[PDB]
Short mmCIF file of C-alpha atoms and ligand atoms in Angstrom, two decimals:
data_model
loop_
_atom_site.label_atom_id
_atom_site.label_comp_id
_atom_site.label_asym_id
_atom_site.label_seq_id
_atom_site.Cartn_x
_atom_site.Cartn_y
_atom_site.Cartn_z
CA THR J 1 29.38 9.58 -7.65
CA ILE J 2 26.09 9.51 -9.60
CA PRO J 3 25.82 8.00 -13.10
CA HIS J 4 24.00 9.85 -15.86
CA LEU J 5 21.68 7.79 -18.05
CA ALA J 6 19.89 8.73 -21.30
CA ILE J 7 17.11 6.18 -20.75
CA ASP J 8 13.72 7.81 -21.18
CA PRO J 9 11.39 5.91 -18.77
CA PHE J 10 8.39 7.67 -20.36
CA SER J 11 9.14 6.59 -23.93
CA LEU J 12 7.00 4.10 -25.79
CA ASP J 13 9.99 1.83 -26.38
CA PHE J 14 10.49 1.76 -22.57
CA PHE J 15 6.79 1.02 -21.93
CA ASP J 16 6.82 -1.74 -24.48
CA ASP J 17 9.46 -3.68 -22.61
CA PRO J 18 10.82 -1.94 -19.48
CA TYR J 19 12.60 -4.84 -17.82
CA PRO J 20 16.07 -4.62 -19.45
CA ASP J 21 16.12 -0.85 -18.85
CA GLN J 22 14.94 -1.28 -15.31
CA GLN J 23 17.83 -3.59 -14.59
CA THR J 24 20.23 -1.06 -16.16
CA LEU J 25 18.68 1.56 -13.87
CA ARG J 26 19.18 -0.72 -10.76
CA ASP J 27 22.72 -1.85 -11.66
CA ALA J 28 24.08 1.57 -12.59
CA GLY J 29 23.91 2.53 -8.93
CA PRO J 30 21.49 3.21 -6.01
CA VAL J 31 20.85 6.66 -7.40
CA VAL J 32 20.92 7.72 -11.06
CA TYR J 33 20.47 11.03 -12.90
CA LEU J 34 18.17 10.86 -15.90
CA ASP J 35 19.53 13.45 -18.35
CA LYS J 36 16.36 13.24 -20.53
CA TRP J 37 14.26 14.97 -17.78
CA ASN J 38 16.81 16.37 -15.33
CA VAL J 39 15.56 14.19 -12.42
CA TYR J 40 17.12 11.79 -10.05
CA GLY J 41 15.94 8.12 -10.11
CA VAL J 42 15.93 5.23 -7.67
CA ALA J 43 15.12 1.80 -8.97
CA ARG J 44 16.33 -0.61 -6.29
CA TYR J 45 13.88 -1.73 -3.60
CA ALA J 46 15.86 -0.44 -0.60
CA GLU J 47 16.13 3.20 -1.87
CA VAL J 48 12.56 3.26 -3.21
CA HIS J 49 11.23 2.01 0.14
CA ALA J 50 13.49 4.48 1.99
CA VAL J 51 12.27 7.49 -0.05
CA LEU J 52 8.66 6.51 0.35
CA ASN J 53 9.08 6.35 4.15
CA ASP J 54 10.94 9.69 4.41
CA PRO J 55 8.19 12.19 3.75
CA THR J 56 9.76 15.17 5.47
CA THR J 57 12.66 15.21 3.03
CA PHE J 58 11.00 13.65 -0.08
CA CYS J 59 7.74 15.56 -0.04
CA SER J 60 4.49 15.24 -2.07
CA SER J 61 3.14 18.81 -1.74
CA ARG J 62 5.22 19.98 -4.68
CA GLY J 63 3.59 17.34 -6.82
CA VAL J 64 4.16 13.61 -7.36
CA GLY J 65 4.58 14.02 -11.08
CA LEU J 66 7.48 15.62 -12.93
CA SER J 67 6.10 19.13 -12.53
CA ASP J 68 7.15 21.11 -9.46
CA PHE J 69 4.18 23.09 -8.06
CA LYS J 70 6.60 25.68 -6.69
CA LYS J 71 7.68 26.37 -10.33
CA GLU J 72 4.59 25.58 -12.52
CA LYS J 73 0.84 25.84 -12.04
CA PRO J 74 -0.82 22.47 -11.40
CA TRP J 75 -2.96 21.40 -14.32
CA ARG J 76 -5.83 20.93 -11.76
CA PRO J 77 -6.18 22.11 -8.11
CA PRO J 78 -3.87 20.00 -6.07
CA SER J 79 -5.09 16.79 -4.51
CA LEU J 80 -5.80 17.33 -0.79
CA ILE J 81 -4.36 13.83 -0.03
CA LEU J 82 -1.96 12.62 -2.77
CA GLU J 83 -0.33 16.07 -3.21
CA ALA J 84 -0.24 17.10 0.46
CA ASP J 85 2.22 16.53 3.24
CA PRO J 86 1.50 15.98 6.99
CA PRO J 87 -0.10 17.65 8.81
CA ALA J 88 -2.41 18.99 6.06
CA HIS J 89 -2.55 15.37 4.72
CA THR J 90 -3.63 13.82 8.00
CA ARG J 91 -7.38 14.55 8.44
CA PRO J 92 -8.29 14.15 4.76
CA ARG J 93 -6.45 10.86 4.78
CA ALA J 94 -8.41 9.83 7.86
CA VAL J 95 -11.69 10.55 6.18
CA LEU J 96 -10.81 8.37 3.20
CA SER J 97 -9.54 5.63 5.50
CA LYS J 98 -12.86 5.62 7.25
CA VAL J 99 -14.97 5.83 4.06
CA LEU J 100 -12.97 2.92 2.56
CA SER J 101 -12.59 1.15 5.93
CA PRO J 102 -12.74 -2.49 6.76
CA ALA J 103 -16.20 -1.93 8.15
CA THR J 104 -17.26 -0.42 4.84
CA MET J 105 -16.06 -3.48 2.94
CA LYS J 106 -18.66 -5.55 4.74
CA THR J 107 -21.38 -3.49 3.12
CA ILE J 108 -20.16 -3.94 -0.45
CA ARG J 109 -18.53 -7.49 -0.47
CA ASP J 110 -21.60 -9.53 -1.34
CA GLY J 111 -22.51 -7.32 -4.29
CA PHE J 112 -18.87 -7.09 -5.48
CA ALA J 113 -18.54 -10.85 -5.36
CA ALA J 114 -21.90 -11.50 -6.94
CA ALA J 115 -21.01 -9.20 -9.85
CA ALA J 116 -17.64 -10.96 -10.29
CA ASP J 117 -19.27 -14.39 -10.35
CA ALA J 118 -21.86 -13.27 -12.88
CA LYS J 119 -19.35 -11.62 -15.14
CA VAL J 120 -17.19 -14.80 -15.32
CA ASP J 121 -20.27 -16.95 -16.09
CA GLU J 122 -21.26 -14.36 -18.73
CA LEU J 123 -17.86 -14.47 -20.33
CA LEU J 124 -17.86 -18.31 -20.23
CA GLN J 125 -21.02 -18.25 -22.35
CA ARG J 126 -19.12 -16.15 -25.02
CA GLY J 127 -16.08 -18.34 -24.93
CA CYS J 128 -13.67 -15.90 -26.67
CA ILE J 129 -13.52 -12.47 -25.14
CA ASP J 130 -11.22 -9.44 -24.66
CA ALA J 131 -9.95 -9.66 -21.05
CA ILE J 132 -9.50 -5.87 -20.95
CA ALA J 133 -12.70 -4.40 -22.41
CA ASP J 134 -14.85 -7.34 -21.36
CA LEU J 135 -13.37 -8.05 -17.93
CA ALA J 136 -10.64 -5.77 -16.51
CA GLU J 137 -12.75 -2.70 -17.51
CA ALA J 138 -16.23 -4.17 -17.54
CA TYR J 139 -16.17 -5.53 -13.98
CA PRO J 140 -14.84 -2.38 -12.22
CA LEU J 141 -17.29 -0.29 -14.24
CA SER J 142 -20.13 -2.55 -13.06
CA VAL J 143 -19.37 -2.12 -9.36
CA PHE J 144 -17.25 0.92 -8.53
CA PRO J 145 -19.28 3.86 -9.99
CA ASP J 146 -22.40 2.47 -8.22
CA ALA J 147 -20.43 2.14 -5.01
CA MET J 148 -19.38 5.77 -5.36
CA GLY J 149 -23.03 6.74 -5.75
CA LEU J 150 -22.49 8.27 -9.21
CA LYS J 151 -25.50 8.94 -11.44
CA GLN J 152 -25.67 7.06 -14.69
CA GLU J 153 -25.28 10.00 -17.01
CA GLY J 154 -21.69 10.84 -17.91
CA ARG J 155 -19.81 7.71 -16.75
CA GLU J 156 -18.27 7.48 -20.26
CA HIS J 157 -15.93 10.26 -18.99
CA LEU J 158 -14.53 8.25 -16.01
CA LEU J 159 -11.85 6.21 -17.79
CA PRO J 160 -10.77 9.10 -20.11
CA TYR J 161 -10.42 11.31 -17.01
CA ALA J 162 -8.29 8.73 -15.14
CA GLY J 163 -6.14 8.23 -18.21
CA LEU J 164 -5.55 11.98 -18.24
CA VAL J 165 -4.76 12.07 -14.51
CA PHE J 166 -2.17 9.29 -14.86
CA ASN J 167 -0.56 10.69 -18.03
CA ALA J 168 -0.39 14.14 -16.37
CA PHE J 169 2.01 12.86 -13.68
CA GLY J 170 4.50 12.28 -16.50
CA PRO J 171 6.77 14.63 -18.25
CA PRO J 172 5.46 17.03 -20.94
CA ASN J 173 5.77 14.49 -23.70
CA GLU J 174 3.11 13.84 -26.36
CA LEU J 175 1.15 11.44 -24.12
CA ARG J 176 0.74 14.18 -21.47
CA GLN J 177 0.02 17.08 -23.72
CA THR J 178 -2.41 15.24 -25.83
CA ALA J 179 -4.20 14.23 -22.60
CA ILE J 180 -4.40 17.71 -21.14
CA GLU J 181 -5.43 19.41 -24.41
CA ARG J 182 -9.24 19.61 -24.69
CA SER J 183 -9.51 17.72 -21.34
CA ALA J 184 -12.06 20.31 -20.15
CA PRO J 185 -15.18 18.12 -20.82
CA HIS J 186 -13.70 15.36 -18.68
CA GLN J 187 -12.80 17.77 -15.88
CA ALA J 188 -16.25 19.43 -16.07
CA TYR J 189 -18.00 16.05 -15.63
CA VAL J 190 -15.90 14.82 -12.75
CA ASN J 191 -15.92 18.20 -10.91
CA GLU J 192 -19.71 18.32 -11.20
CA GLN J 193 -20.18 14.82 -9.83
CA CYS J 194 -18.02 15.67 -6.79
CA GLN J 195 -20.74 18.12 -5.60
CA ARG J 196 -22.92 16.74 -2.81
CA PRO J 197 -26.31 16.87 -4.70
CA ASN J 198 -25.01 14.51 -7.39
CA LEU J 199 -23.88 11.64 -5.11
CA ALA J 200 -26.27 8.96 -3.93
CA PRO J 201 -26.74 8.70 -0.23
CA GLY J 202 -24.91 5.69 1.14
CA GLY J 203 -22.18 5.74 -1.50
CA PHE J 204 -18.52 6.58 -1.05
CA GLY J 205 -19.03 10.12 -2.30
CA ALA J 206 -21.95 10.97 -0.04
CA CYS J 207 -20.10 9.46 2.94
CA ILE J 208 -17.11 11.80 2.26
CA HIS J 209 -19.55 14.75 2.39
CA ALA J 210 -20.99 13.40 5.62
CA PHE J 211 -17.62 13.71 7.27
CA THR J 212 -17.75 17.46 6.83
CA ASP J 213 -19.99 17.41 9.93
CA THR J 214 -17.14 16.02 12.12
CA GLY J 215 -14.56 18.76 11.66
CA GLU J 216 -12.21 16.45 9.86
CA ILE J 217 -12.78 18.19 6.50
CA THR J 218 -14.60 21.33 5.58
CA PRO J 219 -17.54 21.22 3.06
CA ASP J 220 -15.25 22.81 0.39
CA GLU J 221 -12.67 20.01 0.87
CA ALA J 222 -15.20 17.16 0.29
CA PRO J 223 -15.48 17.58 -3.47
CA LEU J 224 -11.73 17.36 -3.95
CA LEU J 225 -11.67 14.14 -1.87
CA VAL J 226 -14.45 12.68 -4.01
CA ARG J 227 -12.30 13.68 -6.95
CA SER J 228 -9.38 11.62 -5.58
CA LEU J 229 -11.60 8.50 -5.62
CA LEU J 230 -12.77 9.33 -9.13
CA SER J 231 -9.13 9.79 -10.21
CA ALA J 232 -7.56 6.69 -8.63
CA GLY J 233 -10.48 4.37 -7.94
CA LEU J 234 -11.16 2.82 -11.33
CA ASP J 235 -8.15 2.86 -13.69
CA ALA J 236 -5.54 1.40 -11.28
CA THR J 237 -7.93 -1.54 -10.56
CA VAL J 238 -8.58 -2.06 -14.27
CA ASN J 239 -4.83 -2.54 -14.77
CA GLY J 240 -4.44 -4.62 -11.63
CA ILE J 241 -7.10 -7.03 -12.74
CA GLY J 242 -5.92 -7.10 -16.27
CA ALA J 243 -2.45 -7.78 -14.94
CA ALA J 244 -3.73 -10.70 -12.87
CA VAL J 245 -5.55 -12.23 -15.86
CA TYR J 246 -2.46 -11.72 -18.00
CA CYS J 247 -0.29 -13.51 -15.41
CA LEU J 248 -2.75 -16.46 -15.15
CA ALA J 249 -2.90 -16.64 -18.99
CA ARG J 250 0.91 -16.83 -19.13
CA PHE J 251 1.51 -19.09 -16.08
CA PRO J 252 -0.96 -22.01 -16.48
CA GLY J 253 0.71 -23.80 -13.57
CA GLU J 254 -0.29 -20.97 -11.30
CA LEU J 255 -3.86 -20.90 -12.62
CA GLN J 256 -3.99 -24.63 -11.72
CA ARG J 257 -2.75 -23.92 -8.20
CA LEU J 258 -5.34 -21.19 -7.85
CA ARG J 259 -8.18 -23.58 -9.00
CA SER J 260 -6.89 -26.12 -6.42
CA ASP J 261 -7.25 -23.63 -3.65
CA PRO J 262 -9.46 -20.57 -4.39
CA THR J 263 -8.48 -19.17 -1.01
CA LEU J 264 -5.22 -18.13 -2.69
CA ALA J 265 -7.21 -15.61 -4.79
CA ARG J 266 -6.31 -12.62 -2.58
CA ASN J 267 -2.62 -13.37 -2.61
CA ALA J 268 -2.74 -14.24 -6.33
CA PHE J 269 -4.00 -10.74 -6.91
CA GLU J 270 -1.37 -9.16 -4.55
CA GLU J 271 1.32 -11.04 -6.45
CA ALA J 272 -0.04 -9.63 -9.74
CA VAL J 273 0.24 -6.16 -8.33
CA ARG J 274 3.93 -6.82 -7.48
CA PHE J 275 4.58 -8.65 -10.74
CA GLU J 276 3.15 -6.03 -13.11
CA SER J 277 3.05 -3.02 -10.79
CA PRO J 278 0.17 -1.33 -12.59
CA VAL J 279 1.24 1.96 -11.03
CA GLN J 280 4.83 2.07 -12.21
CA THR J 281 6.27 5.34 -10.93
CA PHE J 282 5.75 8.37 -8.76
CA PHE J 283 7.88 11.43 -8.01
CA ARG J 284 8.91 13.20 -4.83
CA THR J 285 10.54 16.62 -4.40
CA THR J 286 13.42 17.16 -2.00
CA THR J 287 12.67 19.79 0.65
CA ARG J 288 16.38 20.03 1.64
CA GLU J 289 19.76 18.79 0.62
CA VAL J 290 19.95 15.05 1.37
CA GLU J 291 22.21 12.06 0.86
CA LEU J 292 20.63 8.83 -0.39
CA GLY J 293 22.31 5.46 -0.76
CA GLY J 294 25.74 7.24 -0.61
CA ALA J 295 24.81 9.91 -3.12
CA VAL J 296 23.95 13.56 -2.48
CA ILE J 297 20.92 15.50 -3.76
CA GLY J 298 20.12 19.18 -3.58
CA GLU J 299 16.97 20.91 -2.44
CA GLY J 300 14.01 21.31 -4.71
CA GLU J 301 15.02 18.33 -6.86
CA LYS J 302 12.59 15.81 -8.36
CA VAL J 303 13.20 12.17 -7.51
CA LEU J 304 11.56 9.44 -9.62
CA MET J 305 10.77 6.23 -7.81
CA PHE J 306 10.46 3.11 -10.01
CA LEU J 307 7.99 1.06 -8.06
CA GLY J 308 7.81 -1.68 -10.58
CA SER J 309 11.57 -2.04 -10.66
CA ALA J 310 11.64 -2.16 -6.85
CA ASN J 311 9.12 -4.94 -6.97
CA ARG J 312 11.43 -6.94 -9.32
CA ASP J 313 14.73 -6.10 -7.57
CA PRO J 314 16.71 -9.40 -7.22
CA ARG J 315 18.42 -7.88 -4.18
CA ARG J 316 15.04 -8.27 -2.39
CA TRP J 317 13.04 -10.87 -4.23
CA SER J 318 13.95 -14.45 -5.17
CA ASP J 319 12.92 -15.25 -8.75
CA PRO J 320 11.52 -11.69 -9.14
CA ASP J 321 10.45 -12.38 -12.74
CA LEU J 322 8.25 -15.37 -11.76
CA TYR J 323 4.65 -15.09 -10.92
CA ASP J 324 4.08 -17.17 -7.70
CA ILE J 325 0.70 -17.02 -6.07
CA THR J 326 2.03 -18.26 -2.75
CA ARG J 327 4.91 -15.79 -2.64
CA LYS J 328 5.22 -13.85 0.62
CA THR J 329 4.26 -10.49 -1.04
CA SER J 330 4.34 -8.30 2.11
CA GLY J 331 6.75 -5.38 1.52
CA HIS J 332 6.07 -4.86 -2.10
CA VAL J 333 5.57 -1.21 -3.08
CA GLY J 334 2.88 -1.62 -5.76
CA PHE J 335 0.48 0.19 -3.34
CA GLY J 336 3.17 2.54 -2.08
CA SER J 337 4.54 2.49 1.51
CA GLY J 338 4.29 4.83 4.44
CA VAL J 339 1.96 7.73 5.10
CA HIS J 340 0.57 7.76 1.50
CA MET J 341 0.24 4.00 1.08
CA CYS J 342 -2.84 3.33 -1.03
CA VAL J 343 -5.90 4.33 1.00
CA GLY J 344 -8.09 2.45 -1.46
CA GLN J 345 -6.22 -0.79 -1.03
CA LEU J 346 -9.15 -2.64 0.51
CA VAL J 347 -11.39 -1.80 -2.37
CA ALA J 348 -8.68 -2.83 -4.87
CA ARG J 349 -8.01 -6.12 -3.14
CA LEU J 350 -11.72 -6.76 -2.78
CA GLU J 351 -12.29 -6.43 -6.52
CA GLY J 352 -9.17 -8.41 -7.29
CA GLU J 353 -9.90 -11.20 -4.84
CA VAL J 354 -13.48 -11.84 -5.85
CA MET J 355 -12.67 -11.80 -9.59
CA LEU J 356 -9.78 -14.23 -9.12
CA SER J 357 -12.06 -16.34 -6.86
CA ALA J 358 -14.65 -16.51 -9.61
CA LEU J 359 -12.03 -17.55 -12.16
CA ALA J 360 -10.58 -20.05 -9.76
CA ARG J 361 -13.93 -21.77 -9.24
CA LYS J 362 -15.32 -21.50 -12.80
CA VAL J 363 -12.47 -21.52 -15.36
CA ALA J 364 -10.17 -24.44 -16.29
CA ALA J 365 -7.94 -22.67 -18.75
CA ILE J 366 -7.07 -19.20 -20.13
CA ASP J 367 -5.51 -19.23 -23.47
CA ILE J 368 -4.34 -16.09 -25.26
CA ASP J 369 -6.40 -16.21 -28.50
CA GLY J 370 -5.53 -13.10 -30.55
CA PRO J 371 -3.19 -10.17 -30.82
CA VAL J 372 -2.13 -8.63 -27.54
CA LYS J 373 -1.96 -4.83 -27.55
CA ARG J 374 -0.28 -2.70 -24.92
CA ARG J 375 -1.90 0.50 -23.53
CA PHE J 376 0.64 3.32 -23.17
CA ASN J 377 0.45 5.67 -20.21
CA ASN J 378 3.07 7.78 -18.45
CA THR J 379 2.26 6.20 -15.11
CA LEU J 380 0.09 3.06 -15.71
CA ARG J 381 1.34 -0.22 -17.04
CA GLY J 382 -1.30 -2.44 -18.69
CA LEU J 383 -2.80 -3.80 -21.82
CA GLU J 384 -5.24 -2.28 -24.38
CA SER J 385 -6.47 -5.66 -25.62
CA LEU J 386 -6.08 -9.20 -24.31
CA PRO J 387 -8.05 -11.69 -26.46
CA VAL J 388 -8.42 -14.94 -24.53
CA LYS J 389 -10.43 -18.14 -24.79
CA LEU J 390 -11.91 -19.22 -21.47
CA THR J 391 -12.49 -22.96 -20.92
CA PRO J 392 -15.18 -23.75 -18.28
CA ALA J 393 -14.22 -25.98 -15.31
C1 HEM D 1 -4.59 -2.26 -8.01
C2 HEM D 1 -5.13 -1.08 -7.75
C3 HEM D 1 -4.26 0.17 -7.18
C4 HEM D 1 -2.97 0.42 -7.16
C5 HEM D 1 -1.76 -0.45 -7.77
C6 HEM D 1 -2.76 1.65 -6.49
C7 HEM D 1 -1.59 2.29 -6.29
C8 HEM D 1 -1.33 3.40 -5.46
C9 HEM D 1 -0.02 3.86 -5.06
C10 HEM D 1 1.29 3.30 -5.49
C11 HEM D 1 -0.26 4.91 -4.24
C12 HEM D 1 0.89 5.70 -3.56
C13 HEM D 1 0.95 7.20 -3.96
C14 HEM D 1 2.17 7.84 -3.46
O1 HEM D 1 2.95 7.20 -2.61
O2 HEM D 1 2.44 9.02 -3.90
C15 HEM D 1 -1.67 5.05 -4.05
C16 HEM D 1 -2.31 6.04 -3.27
C17 HEM D 1 -3.70 6.24 -3.36
N1 HEM D 1 -4.69 5.50 -3.88
FE1 HEM D 1 -4.36 3.63 -4.77
N2 HEM D 1 -3.96 2.14 -6.06
C18 HEM D 1 -4.97 1.24 -6.46
C19 HEM D 1 -6.29 1.33 -6.26
C20 HEM D 1 -6.95 2.40 -5.61
C21 HEM D 1 -8.37 2.48 -5.38
C22 HEM D 1 -9.36 1.38 -5.76
C23 HEM D 1 -8.64 3.71 -4.79
C24 HEM D 1 -9.95 4.36 -4.31
C25 HEM D 1 -11.16 3.74 -4.22
C26 HEM D 1 -7.38 4.34 -4.60
C27 HEM D 1 -7.14 5.62 -4.15
C28 HEM D 1 -5.95 6.14 -3.72
C29 HEM D 1 -5.68 7.39 -3.04
C30 HEM D 1 -6.81 8.33 -2.68
C31 HEM D 1 -4.40 7.51 -2.83
C32 HEM D 1 -3.63 8.67 -2.09
C33 HEM D 1 -3.34 8.28 -0.66
C34 HEM D 1 -2.55 9.27 0.06
O3 HEM D 1 -1.90 10.12 -0.56
O4 HEM D 1 -2.50 9.13 1.36
N3 HEM D 1 -6.37 3.59 -5.21
N4 HEM D 1 -2.33 4.11 -4.80
C1 EGM D 2 -3.67 5.62 -7.66
C2 EGM D 2 -2.87 6.86 -7.76
C3 EGM D 2 -3.63 8.20 -7.35
C4 EGM D 2 -3.85 8.42 -6.04
C5 EGM D 2 -4.52 9.59 -5.69
C6 EGM D 2 -5.06 10.44 -6.71
C7 EGM D 2 -5.76 11.70 -6.23
O1 EGM D 2 -5.80 12.12 -5.07
O2 EGM D 2 -6.35 12.38 -7.16
C8 EGM D 2 -4.75 10.20 -8.00
C9 EGM D 2 -4.07 9.05 -8.35
CL1 CL D 3 -10.74 17.78 -12.49
#
């Protein structure tokens, strides 16, 4: 039997402090019904992991937001990777895996690390900075658009466009409808940059187009795959890095452990992804009647997965509410799991690692120094402003 809850997981009060409500969602049962939006929800680790790894029943081709593409028109042409199922998903996924491959990371690591080192030294000269605007946003903006091969003109549209994308996965609340209304200039900029002439040879975007020669994607598929990287490739990392700084500012003991062994930087970042889960939620749509955790669900139903809750589920994690940079993080679902698991995870971890490495080697303390402000988004968890004082090592 399935409990009905009135919790709105897309309300500002929920975003402001989701953790009590997430425990209510977990402890009510393995599967809940959210009467506010007429969707099923799973918030425990086991069921979230199971849904993610059962793509033939919990599909993505009817949308991974609230909207069902079989019932409503998508606000933009469907993503060829995020909003596709196998087999259509497979070859586009392979292209992005190769574009963002381990081999590709060799070509960008030195510049990504150099930019992170320089940014931290720059911020140490200022002393008191906003870790969002001046760090979590500034650093990805300084490396990722260039790595994409984007021209300089128009980059002001990148973060607004991503904010729209992530709000649009949500329900038709004020956040979503404000985001979609008059979004055309953002869409126009992105869609134009996805065309082959506008992408610098050697960058991620041009490499996507180069794979049209192989038969893995057609030329008309390449712009939409560039669009995927321009949708996901900046804003999630902004909130991942901001999350990591927020954790280190709140857990000084863990900053000191990181200073003691900067080779913990990569796992310190992975733990931040688990702890904050910058990508909080995604939907699936059932392709058939299915039973889940003892409960039954009909065909064509939306299922909301609480990734952040799964990453704090005490059934799976010891001390889930503690930030522990030596935690064995493998198994967390902050990057997803299964056939859709973050194809950009090597870029994300690269940025996160080298920024936390720079902090580890250069900073002695991070003290919150002014009002903290949360940024509200139907899908992304993160801060709008994080004023901190950095003390040099
Ligand atoms: C901390 C940073 C990031 C987080 C937390 C994150 C989170 C996620 C999650 C949870 C999914 C699963 C989607 C699903 O199961 O429906 C995903 C997929 C995806 N991500 Fe990431 N992401 C991050 C960074 C990036 C970056 C840097 C890129 C590109 C450069 C990227 C591109 C993608 C793409 C294209 C997909 C779709 C993969 C597929 O459907 O096969 N993401 N991401
Ligand atoms: C990081 C979540 C995300 C993944 C993929 C897309 C896309 O394909 O547009 C958009 C967002
Ligand atoms: Cl678009």
